[PDB]
Design a protein around this ligand. Structure first.
Ligand SMILES: Nc1ncnc2c1ncn2[C@@H]1O[C@H](COP(=O)(O)OP(=O)(O)OP(O)(O)=S)[C@@H](O)[C@H]1O
Ligand SMILES: Nc1ncnc2c1ncn2[C@@H]1O[C@H](COP(=O)(O)OP(=O)(O)OP(O)(O)=S)[C@@H](O)[C@H]1O
Ligand SMILES: [Mg+2]
Ligand SMILES: [Mg+2]
Lengths: 351, 250
């Protein structure tokens, strides 16, 4: 077993590294460690750390890129297909694809939506990632207070693994994932190395190219990512970190727009969810108008979500074991069919 | 000792996996960990760690569904006899089962109760779980501050164990237990990682499907669950969290 066994894996790391355009910072560090692996007995207690370190270091993609759809004409459709309104964020992504159409190679940026809850902030990134066609990911940071998740540990410790971003980058083979940090403003104070101190080193647009996770210390390029971050309010963020990234402000909706979203997605979205059908559980557009005028006039689009869902489920139970084979919601019933209205119709002096 | 060995623990895990209908995603992580176990020397700190983490990955049910009852009036009996009145909630759950019976497969939701103390808000939960047949579980959050309790720890720490809900879930084989958070108003805040920062990830009606626990990183779909939350006065709850979950006033 002089040439057997060890030669297999040592060749294996070659093969997996062949196709990549390995950066020169790494290519020195790799092969000498492969030599060190070639020296020692397979059962040597260190061998299982080195065999691990290569398995990560051979595996994280190095300059491999998932070519993105570039034409914006077709981008308009898919960007619109799954959300309505929100024109300014649509325009910002259109600008980004425009620039990337201009200067050849793909390139990243950072952004930070923020605004009223339920505007659609978290609900868009999946759409964008389908739009550009760069690989999606998501990574909530809410309440996190341990920097190790953004960094990893030193590999001296048993079982140490690289910071979460590297696990992402392995799991989404392309080098330019659409990372989506989330709920940034509610990130915790860990009272010993809180994460806000960490994030600045990642998110700085110029310094980002040399992020260095503690586990495998070799620098990784990261300009290509398109980070996105969201928060319902933008005061908790420390001042420099607030400086680092653009703050698009998602807008709250208005009752014309609420009705607009209503017919297009919401009612179908839940009618399929409950299994009802057209002509068995019909809703007038005037019922949808009245729900907004009376029962829900808040900036979000969750509240109306719950009204228009409950209105269906009442009909659900009212059919399957009730006496009517088909409900037909009409305005005359709503005051009882959903509860008493919140908003009053301010009609005091008609005389 | 029945010849304890690498291939034996590898088998017992493998056999344990079969009945489950695992998501294709986590199956690959398990297959890598299995090879990494087999190569690893038997007695070493890395080995016992990785064996433990793989044990947890097999222990979590994947796709098991304790049967949800379907009959309405027969459920109405068990929801009526042991708690007088409170027509609102007894009507709500009845509507919900009417839907779940209608659209085939079981499906979760989320909701919350609020009102004067002693109205029975906590009392009704176990009656519900007996009515719909979902396995019960409860865990007060009152006064809790350490966020890790609902998200575990990194697993490279010596004794780290997965967050609370996963412990709730391994013990009761259903993928759809009726978790019953209690006293949401009085979660700890203002000096350590607020649990409220974390709860949004759970209670998001749709995004919960990729809840991601620190210990076992692999996303844990839990959309089928039926959370319930209680709080005698609905003011201390920060607004974004109050958005997620429909209020009901006994
Ligand atoms: N223009 C839109 N079209 C369709 N659905 C929308 C739109 N805007 C918002 N939504 C809905 O908003 C819901 C939640 O989206 P989210 O962005 O998660 O809400 P949110 O604004 O992130 O609130 P948070 O979680 O407090 S930051 C989803 O059910 C979407 O369907
Ligand atoms: N309709 C009812 N039938 C029978 N017992 C009831 C009813 N409503 C309330 N109770 C009683 O309410 C008592 C306590 O119920 P709880 O739900 O704990 O009250 P509570 O409203 O939860 O108050 P908390 O603990 O401050 S939130 C039990 O002894 C029940 O027997
Ligand atoms: Mg959100
Ligand atoms: Mg109680």
């Amino acid at each position: 077993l002089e040439k057997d066994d060890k030669d297999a894996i040592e060749e294996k790391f070659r093969e997996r590294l062949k196709e990549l355009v390995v950066p020169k910072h790494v290519m020195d560090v790799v092969d000498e460690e492969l030599s060190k692996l070639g020296l020692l007995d397979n059962h040597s207690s260190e061998f299982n750390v080195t065999r691990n370190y290569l398995d990560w270091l051979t595996s994280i993609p190095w300059g491999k890129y998932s070519n993105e759809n570039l034409d914006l004409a077709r981008a308009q459709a898919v960007l619109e297909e799954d959300h309505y309104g929100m024109e300014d964020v649509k325009k910002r992504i259109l600008e980004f694809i425009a620039v990337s159409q201009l200067r050849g190679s793909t390139q990243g940026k950072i952004l930070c939506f923020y605004g009223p809850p339920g505007v659609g902030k978290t609900s868009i990134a999946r759409s964008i990632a389908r739009a550009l066609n760069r690989e999606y990911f998501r990574f909530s940071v809410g309440g996190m207070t341990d920097v190790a998740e953004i960094k990893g540990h030193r590999r001296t410790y048993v079982g140490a693994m690289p910071g979460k971003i590297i696990q992402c980058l392995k799991k989404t083979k392309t080098e330019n994932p659409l990372i989506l940090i989330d709920e940034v403003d509610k990130i915790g104070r860990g009272y010993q190395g809180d994460p806000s101190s960490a994030l600045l080193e990642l998110l700085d647009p110029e310094q980002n190219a040399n992020f260095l996770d503690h586990y495998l210390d070799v620098p990784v390029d990261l300009s290509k990512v398109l980070f996105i971050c969201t928060a319902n309010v933008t005061d908790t963020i420390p001042e420099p970190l607030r400086d680092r990234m653009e703050m698009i402000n998602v807008s709250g909706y208005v009752a014309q727009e609420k009705l607009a979203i209503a017919e297009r997605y919401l009612v179908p979205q839940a009618r399929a969810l409950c299994g009802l059908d057209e002509s068995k559980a019909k809703l007038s557009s005037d019922v949808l108008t009245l729900l907004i005028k009376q029962y829900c006039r808040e900036s979000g689009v969750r509240n109306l979500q719950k009204q228009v869902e409950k209105v269906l489920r009442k009909s659900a139970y009212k059919i399957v074991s009730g006496e009517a084979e088909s409900v037909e919601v009409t305005p005359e019933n709503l005051q009882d069919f959903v509860g008493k209205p919140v908003f009053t119709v301010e009609r005091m002096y008609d005389v």
